[PDB]
């Protein structure tokens, strides 16, 4: 057998070879099966002779090969044969398939598709033939003899593949199946066929099997449809994520899902490296543009992809713009949606890109390093770009929200990833020490948070310590923030503490003022955290107990500093003030310093206090002024020196009750009383006097505070308190804002004591005060004035001034006391102060809103509508009994309180209706001739309303009727309520414009379109009223013009939208009917309004061009679509 075939190969073609074949016909099965079992290399050339013994020139040759080919294939898959034998066989089969005729190749390939139905091949190695078969087919464009011939090589190859896609691929070989298409040239249809069919499988595989498949799919894209490949992978995982995230609301998968997603992301970034189009496509695809998309565009997965794509340099700038701009859009839209009810009806809420990126950080935990670098770097770009700027140099909601997300990314990455912890920190600090005058505060806050998070990481942190060297070179505001935040580290690392001491030690010697002002803040801060244990008898730290490790701090540590600080009391007034403030804070935290601080304060007063009993100027106010060379400065703000000694004494008496101190605190008590009694008794000369004036004004204001807290009892002291005010008022008339030296706790207590407090024995307390009555509203003026100063900055003058808990408390205290007086002219102030209170509590203390309302007595919305009722009732009362001219001022800010409160009302709510409907009642049932009042009532009306074009169309009917045609009255609606409905409607147009642009971008839809019509329809009716009517020529004319041309731009936008939508067409009655409703009620009435202007008077062109362009696209619309409506607009 074997040998006899060897001669035929070395003899010649045809006669020798082909004749032996016809002799056999029986088993090339049993022969080949066992001939490789004997020797595989004897089988290796067995084909070469037999294949050249059966050419395509003869059929018995060609139709014989088909049997051989099927036997080789059968053995390769079924047999256990070694891979050298296996791959040698398919080696030959692949290289000899070239010349087989069209009919046979089709049969061969259909045998594969036949195998595909159900087989255990265990081998796709058979399938490696398929590519060569399918290509050899497409070579021949000629009809072939099979069945109905009617088909070229390309079409049988297309129908073969076509069938391969409709048959089920087994879970086992499907990877090898997809790697088979790798070598086969395809049509776009054949591609999308193979692709979309591979995709149909994803949902059928165990998750861990997808990444290799996705890899195998992506190698096809290289020849093959980028956008659809990506969109597929993205869409698959987006959905997969969606489910897992709903499993989270009710680790397990997280290991697999996210590890795979990382590998998958890692795979496509890898492709983007080799092919840039792939990248440029991923960007083109994901890019927001019209905003309906970026909500559905970006998902945690795609964002993570983008962020990992960052690692390829060239794409970085782009990835960041996309993300940066999407974070703003995402917010600015949701910011809009919350503003209008109608938008909520049309558009459902959307997860915003913000909380998406944060989920990326969250999910980044599982082996995503590639994603972190771009993550932290993005977080910074937000903080960099959206951080506050001009506030330092003489809707930012987005600016803020962006910046915070920048911080949150940064903080949360830090928490999650140990390896970048250092780089995040270095990056923050280096901005702090390096950045300009440009405000760094937001960066210090993050620095604070990182530290506070885990002080243990940074305890050492030379990078923090090294920062201190710039302590003098940095702005005081920075140094404070830096020190405050750095505290938890100081309590831990000795070497950092000691290094800060040494730095501060010599900071004190800096000539420059601001430098020393910093050094002080530092020491003062140290003293708050640092104790001694000394020689003695919030838990600061003992600097003293380790003497081997500290070369600087000793038992003298606390006193050493106070002495160092003492010298500043002889320095500029500005410093002394700062040292007075510090001493109190410090004293409160450190008990042992009471003597040392007090001593210093005491001996300071000794300079300004006349000891000789009764030399009537009890304090020497001449020494408070220094003069050098034509300039008169105040040194030593005595009024604060007094306040400080007051608040310390008050503390020492108050708190420490567990000797040379008791002699100190008596002698100062003696001195304060002595001053108390004795006290009641432009050009350089005058510049000094004015200072002294408000010095005393303060001194009296301080002595007032002191004699109250001395004893809250006697009528005898309140007699002094009044007399002390009588001295204060005395100078206050003789001549002021944040200047109130009364601590806010005091301004609370006494206002609670004056109004609410009666039950106490003394009516003479109140009377000594109430009877003056200027003191009465002076005491209400400080409170009202400090609350206001509390909205200018976050601070307030005295002790616990910046403590947000003590401030909230004092706010609650003061509020309900102003409420007691307003339920019962001072009563006017209370409202004004009461007003500023609410506004502060809401826009600062918001989370404490629930607490706040409780101090005043669904439940949050309950408290709101309760207070609203009390106010809306006293507004109605002001109106119902209103006498002629009464108050434009009380009516104004009474509405302000309501508008502030109404924002607490849930937009759904039963209570919210009570407020809206009630307002609607006042609008219809009232009027008045002061413009101030209506614009407010309207704004409040609108404010509540838009969360519920009627009002607009109706409001115009009024102005239109009460003006022109050439409840609010002539003086009311003409100048004012005109501009409002115009502005309001303009906004309602911007809405429509966005809707109109939204639908265009999609390349439930109708439900919106008909709402757009009804919206625009009611608006045309609105303008018609105004376009008819005469209005004062000054402004409202121009505003009505601008507003008009806007509708025409909106309609034009609605028009060229249907030019687009009807290319794919019917333009239903909705559209049509109202299209000519414009060319009847508007167009002509407009042309007539422009003539009103020129005939009266003796922008303009912008109205006509708008109407012209409006018609120009109606001409294009009507012609190219269906209806003659434009010809019906002229009728």
Curated annotation (Swiss-Prot):
Instruction: Give the molecular function GO annotations.
Output: DNA polymerase binding
- GO biological-process terms attached to the record: DNA repair; positive regulation of protein ubiquitination
GO-annotated cellular components: cytoplasm; cytosol; DNA repair complex; nucleoplasm
Phosphothreonine modification sites? 861
Glycyl lysine isopeptide (Lys-Gly) (interchain with G-Cter in ubiquitin) cross-link, renumbered residues: 506
Q: In which broad location class does this protein mainly occur, judging by the first location in its UniProt entry?
A: nucleus
Q: Which UniProt keywords apply?
A: Cell cycle, Cytoplasm, DNA damage, DNA repair, Isopeptide bond, Nucleus, Phosphoprotein, Ubl conjugation
InterPro entries assigned: FANCI (IPR026171), FANCI_HD1 (IPR029310), FANCI_HD2 (IPR029312), FANCI_S1 (IPR029308), FANCI_S1-cap (IPR029305), FANCI_S2 (IPR029315), FANCI_S3 (IPR029313), FANCI_S4 (IPR029314)
Location in the cell: Nucleus; Cytoplasm
- Ubl conjugation is among the record's keywords: yes
| Presence of the UniProt keyword Ubl conjugation in the record | yes
Query: Looking at the record's lineage, which domain of life comes first?
Result: Eukaryota
- PTMs per UniProt: Monoubiquitinated by FANCL on Lys-506 during S phase and upon genotoxic stress. Deubiquitinated by USP1 as cells enter G2/M, or once DNA repair is completed. Monoubiquitination requires the FANCA-FANCB-FANCC-FANCE-FANCF-FANCG-FANCM complex. Ubiquitination is required for binding to chromatin, DNA repair, and normal cell cycle progression. Monoubiquitination is stimulated by DNA-binding. Phosphorylated in response to DNA damage by ATM and/or ATR. Phosphorylation of FANCI promotes ubiquitination of FANCD2, which prevents DNA release from the FANCI-FANCD2 complex.
Which family does this protein fall into?
Answer: Belongs to the Fanconi anemia group I protein family.
Subunit-level organization: Homodimer. Part of a FANCI-FANCD2 heterodimeric complex that binds and scans dsDNA for DNA damage. Interacts with FANCL. Interacts with MTMR15/FAN1. Interacts with POLN. Interacts with UBL5; the interaction promotes FANCI homodimerization.
What the record says about its domains?
A: The C-terminal 30 residues are probably required for function in DNA repair.
The job of this chain, per UniProt, is described as: Plays an essential role in the repair of DNA double-strand breaks by homologous recombination and in the repair of interstrand DNA cross-links (ICLs) by promoting FANCD2 monoubiquitination by FANCL and participating in recruitment to DNA repair sites. The FANCI-FANCD2 complex binds and scans double-stranded DNA (dsDNA) for DNA damage; this complex stalls at DNA junctions between double-stranded DNA and single-stranded DNA. Participates in S phase and G2 phase checkpoint activation upon DNA damage.
State what protein this is by name: Fanconi anemia group I protein homolog
Species assigned in the record: Mus musculus
* Encoding gene (name): Fanci
